[PDB]
Amino acid sequence: GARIGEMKRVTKETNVSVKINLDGTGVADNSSGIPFLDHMLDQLASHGLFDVHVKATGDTHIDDHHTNEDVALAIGTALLQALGDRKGINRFGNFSAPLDEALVHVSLDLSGRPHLGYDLNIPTQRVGKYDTQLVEHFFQSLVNTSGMTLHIRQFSGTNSHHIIEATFKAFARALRQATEYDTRR
Amino acid sequence: GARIGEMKRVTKETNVSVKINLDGTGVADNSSGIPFLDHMLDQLASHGLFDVHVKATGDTHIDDHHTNEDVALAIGTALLQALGDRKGINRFGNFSAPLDEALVHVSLDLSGRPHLGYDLNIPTQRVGKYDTQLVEHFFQSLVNTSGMTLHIRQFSGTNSHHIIEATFKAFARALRQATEYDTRR
Amino acid sequence: GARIGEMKRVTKETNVSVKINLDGTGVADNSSGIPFLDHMLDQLASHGLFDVHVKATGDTHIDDHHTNEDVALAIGTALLQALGDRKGINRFGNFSAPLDEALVHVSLDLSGRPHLGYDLNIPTQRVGKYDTQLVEHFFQSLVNTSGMTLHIRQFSGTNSHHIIEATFKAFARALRQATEYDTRR
Amino acid sequence: GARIGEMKRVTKETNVSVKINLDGTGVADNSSGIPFLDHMLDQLASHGLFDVHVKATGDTHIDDHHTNEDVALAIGTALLQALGDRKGINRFGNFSAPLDEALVHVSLDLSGRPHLGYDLNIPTQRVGKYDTQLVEHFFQSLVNTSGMTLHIRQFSGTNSHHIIEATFKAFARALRQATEYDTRR
Amino acid sequence: GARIGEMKRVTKETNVSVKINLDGTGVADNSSGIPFLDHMLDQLASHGLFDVHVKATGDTHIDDHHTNEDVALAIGTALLQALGDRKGINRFGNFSAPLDEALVHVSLDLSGRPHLGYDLNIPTQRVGKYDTQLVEHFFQSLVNTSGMTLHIRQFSGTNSHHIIEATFKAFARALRQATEYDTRR
Amino acid sequence: GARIGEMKRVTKETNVSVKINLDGTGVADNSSGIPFLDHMLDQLASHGLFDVHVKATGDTHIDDHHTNEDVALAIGTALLQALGDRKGINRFGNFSAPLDEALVHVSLDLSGRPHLGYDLNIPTQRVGKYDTQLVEHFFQSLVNTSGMTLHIRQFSGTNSHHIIEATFKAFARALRQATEYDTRR
């Protein structure tokens, strides 16, 4: 059976629905209210081969912060539920993903203990309309509800879009590795 | 057949017995006379899926140095014997293992040529009763008798226990990769 | 209607049992297997007016790390259970506690989002047999399971025992304020 | 069917013939007119398990530059042709290869967009008769005709031969990974 | 006609008995109450070919300082008595002893004038339970009662046990050379 | 009962045959395919009074590296065989050899534990056709197969030929002292 986690949460500020299939085929279905975040969540599907369904509405007239945060929290919760007892999985994941001049390494452990190590140098404040401070907050919130150990280290990159997209590719491939089953155990 | 190496050696200072199964199931059986080293040798089993049997007695009333050294030498010798002609194996191993804020990369080659590259920053002198200088000596001695190329690089970490434990996890997973058989060749 | 939380957790490394009364009278009953942590948990009772009961055994022959962590994890969970729906409480707590030359400020929010801001300068590595790296790990683990926002800032201090004890007094008094009921709410 | 690419090109300066089998068994057949480059192309076969056939003649009486360049261009073209529509492959490759004191990480993406990130510190100007400036030009030209994203980062090394050879091992193993088929998709 | 010196001194703090044979065969019988010093005194015997017998009890419940000092004072006196009129001996001794990464040079003159030039950089405070400040005090006390000119210079070394042990190997070999007879004289 | 070691090793890269007599008369018979290494191996014979016989062919059309390494590896193994059980030997050797403006100290121990401490500053890249990076590789490979502790320290020198030759003279004289018998043992 496919490991599926879902979370729905409605607050005064946001309305969030997420479903994730750890054993998916790369189905991307992301409409967070934040177009650049949808593009990044798409990478999680096509590079991690997860099925990622995110539908969010929120107070984006204020800014994208609350939506960005609640989507990440909900994804963390869904990821945690889909993992179940976590028996038999690789648990650790590693990947360095280039995107042209950008190169980001992600190392993670599905440990049950939240920690974010974040070392990105994003040189512009907006990619499209997306506030680039929200990248760090996305991953911080995600590790907080999933209980993940997550390290993101930038080795190269000047274009903010490239840097952020490379981060999500490496994250997706590291998370795919960590969630996959260890054939020897 | 399982690739098993054993070494027994008795000196004036130490009495060392080691057995390693490269094709194990993660059986940990470590009583080196150094409780913190036993914990680290346990990681070698649970994360490398080796079967690791270490029984040592020694002149720990002086300090843990001679025991620490002779255990490492013996493990290196057992690892070398279990490897045999080394035909068909991956030979190289790579892994970055986080432990909370700690992150250590290990890259190794079962080359037949000993070399230790060691770049850890352990900020305290004792973890429990374990002298933290012995970590470097453990790996130096191990590479010396096994003929291993070994690189240990710390990217992150403040807690000495975390740093050392992350080193052993990454080592175990890199060594597992290097000792496993390459299915294409 | 006293707010009581309890947590038992047994692992291969530790056996931990904790009970905390947010509306206590300062009853301390702490036997963690780490005498200096017991002294600090006693401070939590007498300065926060909590009833704190901690009974733990663990692999202290390796070092104090696993016990220290699992005790803090359990206290964090017990604290979360005792808080219930969190209706009517002050939620925020603030206190600056001097201890002779030491002065530590604690600012915290029972927010549901874990974060530790930690800025202590403990100039020695051992207080008694207690590894001073474990202080930061204690609060980090506690915030992780309680979902607390916690900021610890040293304004003064040279004696390690003083710095750490001032931290626990300030934490105890800040948490007391936060868990107390807002009379206007 | 095996993914085979071939390129032949004759200019006033050079006569180049290359054939590559992405699904090979490690057959090395390299006679570029540059003995040290042949040794490096051999690594591509034995460590990448490609079948690599290179036969070049050229104006080496001037220097090795034109031959070095045209061999790399031709390899890039052959690699591109063998890849075809690139459906189903891993596409990304990662490897850190030690050679004694040397350690080089290679991260690559078969993206269709050429880019070389090159960070090697080769401390001598000649390895044998091979001008060490040609290493960078080899990879630059190769990425140019294959459309590859390629990052080469030196973490360690003092012997120029070791550094260069470690680069080619890591490249071969990263390229093997990138060209291999993803079993899940 | 073997040169044997012997000192016995009982104080409120320690009870010390030492016997040294300059023309010995390496018989070690050292029980100073300080295990690490015993290990070092054993090196004095096997590397200098002295017969070294040290028996001591002392207020080690305070620390090892008084025992360490009084043992060193007693050996120096015994060494002085064994040397007699010092006629015919080499008088000067020189040796550089490696111990793995450590390298210590000892140059000495059995001059009748005490002087210690001491240039060791011991990076940890305890080897086992042995306070590494006691190394300098040992040699300072020994030169004071023997009337020796002694220079100890560290050229290399990171492991504290190695540095100290290389120091005693080089001292023993330099002292052996200095106490041996000059055949032309 | 002369102590003689021999080693033949044939690889696809090199064909190496070495014979060494620890109790020789300085007979040199060196044809390694590297004329400058031959000159240095002649120094080993005349200054150490070893009989040194080296016959090698190899892929010197690539560069001198593989030949240089395999010759040193073989000499190290032959040296180890000739040493036998190592009973009665001095084991340690020390020598400072001037050559005009050059001055190099060699300190070594036939310990069974490989370590190279290497501190030479060779200011040119080629002595004749000999790549000066290969000097360090020669001694590193030799210590690895002989199990020698070896420290090489340049105190003076500007001419590369002088620096390297002084190194071989000091090494030859130090190894002679170490392999000679301790008359008192």
Ligand SMILES: [Mn+2]
């Ligand atoms: Mn807000």
Ligand SMILES: [Mn+2]
């Ligand atoms: Mn926020």
Ligand SMILES: [Mn+2]
């Ligand atoms: Mn994009």
Ligand SMILES: [Mn+2]
């Ligand atoms: Mn040692």
Ligand SMILES: [Mn+2]
């Ligand atoms: Mn642990």
Ligand SMILES: [Mn+2]
């Ligand atoms: Mn921990």
Ligand SMILES: [Mn+2]
């Ligand atoms: Mn107190």
Ligand SMILES: [Mn+2]
């Ligand atoms: Mn040109």
Ligand SMILES: [Mn+2]
């Ligand atoms: Mn060009």
Ligand SMILES: [Mn+2]
């Ligand atoms: Mn090579």
Ligand SMILES: [Mn+2]
């Ligand atoms: Mn004193």
Ligand SMILES: [Mn+2]
């Ligand atoms: Mn020792």
Ligand SMILES: [Mn+2]
């Ligand atoms: Mn080499």
Ligand SMILES: [Mn+2]
């Ligand atoms: Mn010459």
Ligand code: NA
């Ligand atoms: Na979308």
Ligand code: NA
């Ligand atoms: Na155990």
